[PDB]
């Protein structure tokens, strides 16, 4: 049951636990070899320099990833790069440097076709998450195979990434590799949900209290109590604000308040396996995980308000007993069992917390329902025949007239042009409807990921975007709001182009040829030399890609050809496409 | 259900943020027969506290009506067409006007503070909360999503407004700047006065944050707030909270919220077929240009004598729905800004600009066929000038070029009131030719009008800004030119020779 969902058996769990414990003594990582498995454990650093970087100025020690080193970790359409904790990131690129011999080890490990596992205790777990991301970005995305499928197993790790991080993980379908054990009271999962200033006072004492090696430090009542208190207050505010942002309701009142609040961006990423004295409870829903992080740790009654904080610290060192007593516990996947009220009380969840978790699950179900409805709409016969009528009827008949569809639309002397315009309007309407839902994200993370949503969008773009270019330059909208590329181009086409580019790569646009040739014509050659040259250089690449078709573009009546005639004798003589 | 969850979560959130405790601490500070107010400038925000004498019980029912044209009303900007008048609470408004003097400079300073991107809070006690609300409203006369706006926080205040003020701010962006805290045992007879802004009802089990005013009505219809704040803090550490407010109220809130969200996305749906209606209008304009009449004068003719049913459909089905839709758009957006960066993010603004420049001539024809006068200053409806101004505001930020050697056969004229001016000049020529016994000074001032309009025609022509479809034979413009040529005698102007050198058909090429 457990292994079916998570993809790892108890043997690998125990071996990663032992390797993580071994990694304390080494420097920054320990390499263990068990037959076909190669486990890279990472050394936890319980110093407060290793949770909030000193040179970082933000209130959570977070930084945007470099888009070159972690390209796949971003929103493909919008273009926003993800946010990671800079302490752990600096740790990762410190270990990565060629002098450390980590990279040669992992590459000889992939040459030997071994199951690579990244693991670690509390902060070693965060370093393991980041190293798993780096590995997925450098090796798994180049030549994907099941022989390269990594695994990340963490025990009481803290949150590493923001919402865009978890989204990019869910989109590339990578969030299944990660497993993060969290006992019912461990505090290190919850720490980075609090502000730096909220815990900057009592952080050194508690981090010394959390280090397993040096038990020389002695417990202080008030430091632990106060640290746990604010950690829980910041957690409660972040959780309530995630509840209020569920459906987007009452957002404006929240917006007034949001201007008065700082909230942790970090969000759970991957599968989280809560553990008790009787049960294992796996969750995969980031928002449900976030609500459980607060409501599971709440006190059963006020008399226990004394016992809860101390146990917290103690429970950060219970993973030995956890792994040893793993088989005797009862397991049940929360997201899949349709009756969770008994499980939540068993976990330690009040009534209202149970309802908030229920609401997060219901919102996930509504997201998948919205995906179902969009799939039903885009597959119907009327939409497909609207897309087809432009390829089977408009473009061929406009090729017959030796002018082309883009010109035939521009001059617009037939009923065909009116029908083309109304069809283009309705197509743009449905694509704008779906675009907003994706921008809303009321859609599952895999949507931008799916190839079918990608083929449909790129076909629609290649067919219809020249029509819009013609509509823009036909009614002199150019002379009103500027060049098309800057302010005229719709968002849907940019989303589609970026989705296609990301999918295939893992005047710059293809279907924007007409846009360029518009600004090119009518100017002296001495100033459009370089632009004309770049266009005709890429022209062949689009023709190889398919975006542009020579049939249409090279007809006698076509605007681009009649313009290219006007060019300088020397240019047309030495032009690459002279033979056309 | 989702709505009760959002309410209780927002309540706990606002309690945990800590604003309530700081504001009540400052109120206690100022606490221990006129309005007294203090300021508290801090590092995180600026705070203001008002305070008023004990509430006069019977003297609190009376109200004082206001009007848009009245200049005793300090709020001319919030009232609008459908709501030009709104009454207010009498003692609250009295104490606000009484103290307007120094809080004028205070308003200048607080506006500067908000310009500095620093938060601002106003707060109030039992009766001074009403005055704080009035001051916040006076502060919110220029609201943009990007600009920082204040926030009012009130404890135990009675109502200040009637149904009309509640209707002015029912869904506006200003209702998002008020927060009242009422003990669930407080009962307010709301027969005449109506509440507004977000409410926070405090039980002993916990608080609940309401936004729908109907729910607030049914809850409050029909006390030391330090005690209930302490009970809130205690309930923050109480294991169980039960259903405080009845479930039928939740039913109502959920129903109204769903209705509002579907009503909102309906217009995003509708714009797509509005574009198709405008495509039909484009076809109609093309056909009217074929017969050398122009769709303006053809539309006028058919509006006088309906003969073609195609034009009957154009007028009754396309234009009416375009007008209704865009009126609804402008009426809804100016109370709830879109996208933050601009009203009508980008599709609505540009589509509305094209809608205006294409459809306002038809409304001008309908206006001047009815026999009215002076359209530009008296005729055009609100949404037209709103669209024009909102496009002008962003038309300067964008970089554009207007080539000289282009076809203008489909150029829509930017000054959409061109035909109104043409018809006004036609009317003054009709006067100068037909009326008898008229004075001479009036004759020369009408010649002033005529030469002014001639220059206006010439400035728009030489600027390459007018559609050549005005030079059609059956057009109203060429008829007006024939009249003005008859009555001009032999005065000579570049436009007059321009009309005589027969270069007007070479125009637009």
Swiss-Prot record, chain A:
Biological process terms in GO annotation: aerenchyma formation; defense response to Gram-negative bacterium; leaf abscission; lipid metabolic process; plant-type hypersensitive response; regulation of hydrogen peroxide metabolic process; response to hypoxia; response to singlet oxygen
| Cellular location(s) | Nucleus; Cytoplasm; Microsome
| Listed name of the protein | Protein EDS1
Pfam families the UniProt entry points to: EDS1_EP, Lipase_3
Active-site residues per Swiss-Prot or TrEMBL entry:
122, 186, 316
Q: Any coiled-coil ranges, and where?
A: 357-382
Organism encoding this protein? Arabidopsis thaliana
User: Residues where N-acetylalanine occurs?
Assistant: 1
Q: Does the keyword Hydrolase apply?
A: yes
Swiss-Prot record, chain B:
Q: What's a GO cellular component annotated to this UniProt protein?
A: membrane
GO: which molecular function terms?
carboxylesterase activity; carboxylic ester hydrolase activity
One matching Pfam family, short form?
Answer: EDS1_EP
Q: One GO biological process from the UniProt record?
A: positive regulation of defense response to virus by host
**Tissue-specificity statement:** Expressed in senescing leaves.
Q: What is the effect of changing residue 121 to A?
A: No effect on interaction with EDS1. Loss of interaction with EDS1
Q: What induces it?
A: Specifically induced during senescence via a complex epigenetic processe involving histone methylation.
Which reaction equation describes what this protein catalyses? a carboxylic ester + H2O = an alcohol + a carboxylate + H(+)
PANTHER family in the record, alphabetically? FUNGAL LIPASE-LIKE DOMAIN-CONTAINING PROTEIN (PTHR46898:SF3), SENESCENCE-ASSOCIATED CARBOXYLESTERASE 101 (PTHR46898)
Q: Which function does this protein serve?
A: Acyl hydrolase that triggers the leaf senescence onset. Can use triolein as substrate to produce oleic acids. Involved in the EDS1-dependent intrinsic and indispensable resistance signaling pathway; together with PAD4, required for programmed cell death triggered by RPS4 in response to avirulent pathogens (e.g. P.syringae pv. tomato strain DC3000 and H.parasitica isolates CALA2 and EMWA1) and in restricting the growth of virulent pathogens (e.g. H.parasitica isolates NOCO2 and P.syringae pv. tomato strain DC3000 avrRps4). Contributes in reinforcing the immune response around hypersensitive response foci. Regulates the nuclear localization of EDS1.
- UniProt name for this protein: Senescence-associated carboxylesterase 101
User: What organism does the record attribute this protein to?
Assistant: Arabidopsis thaliana (Mouse-ear cress)
Question: Its encoding gene is what?
Answer: SAG101
